[PDB]
Design a protein around this ligand. Sequence first.
Ligand SMILES: O[C@@H]1[C@H](O)[C@H](O)CO[C@H]1O
Length: 283
Amino acid sequence: TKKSAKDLKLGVSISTTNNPYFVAMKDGIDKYASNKKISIKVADAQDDAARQADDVQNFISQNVDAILINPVDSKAIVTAIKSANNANIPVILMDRGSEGGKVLTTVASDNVAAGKMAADYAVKKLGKKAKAFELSGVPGASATVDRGKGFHSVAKSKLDMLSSQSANFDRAKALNTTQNMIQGHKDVQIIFAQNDEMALGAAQAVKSAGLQNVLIVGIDGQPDAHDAIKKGDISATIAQQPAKMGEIAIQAAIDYYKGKKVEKETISPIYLVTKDNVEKYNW
Ligand SMILES: O[C@@H]1[C@H](O)[C@H](O)CO[C@H]1O
C-alpha cells in the first residue's frame, strides 16, 4: 500500500476547539498539511464521545487514507477505532491515548511526568506540607488520570491536599470551582490545574477573592499563560508542543504510505516555564 503524499486525504478529529491548546494544534496541523501537499478536513467533536464516533465514520465514508484522532474518552474511542481498523484506515492518536484498538502511532506527552514537575515546583518553591488544591480534567481522558498520578506521587508526601475536584479542562467551570474551593479553605497556598484553561480560571477567582500569595501552576504553555506569569496572575506552566504533536502525526501518515516504518510511541517533550523562562518554549 503506497499512495502519493501529494493529494493525500486525511481526517482530523479534535475533541474541542473552545480550548486554545487544541486550536494551536489545528493551526499547526494545517500548516504542515499545506506544506507537504496533503488535503485535510478537520472535525470538531465539542468534547462529545458520540459526535466523535460519527465524525470518524464520516471520514471513513469520505475514503480518507488516515484518521488523526484526539480522543475525548480513551475508552469510548476504541469502538470507532476498530471501525477504522476494519476499513483498513490507519489510526494516528494525538495528545491523548486509547485503551485498545490497532493504532499506527501515538504522539503525546508524558502526562505522568507533567504532574511530576508541578508538585516538584510547588515543593521547591513553597516548601513541604503546603496546602494545595488540584483542578482535574475530563475524567475519561488519559491525560487527566496520568497528570493526577504523576502529581500525587510527589503529593502524598511533601504536600497537604485540601481538595481535588474537576473542572473538565474549562476556564469557566474552573472559575466557579476555585471560588467555592476558596470559601472553605482560605489558607490555600498553591493551586495545581492540569490545563491552562483552568489555571487562568483559577487566577481570576484568586484575585477576585483578594488573595495575594497563592502560587498557581498550569499545564500547556499557552500564549495567554506566558502573559499571566508576567502579570503575576499565575506562577508557572508545564509547556507542551501541540503543533509539533500534530505535525509528527501527519508525517507518520506520510511515512507509512512511503514504505517506511513509523514508531509505535512518540513522546512529546515538556518544559517548565517560570518568570525567567517566559521567552522560551513558546508555541
Ligand atoms: O493536553 C491537552 C491539553 O492539556 C488541553 O488543555 C486539555 O486536553 C489535554 O489532553
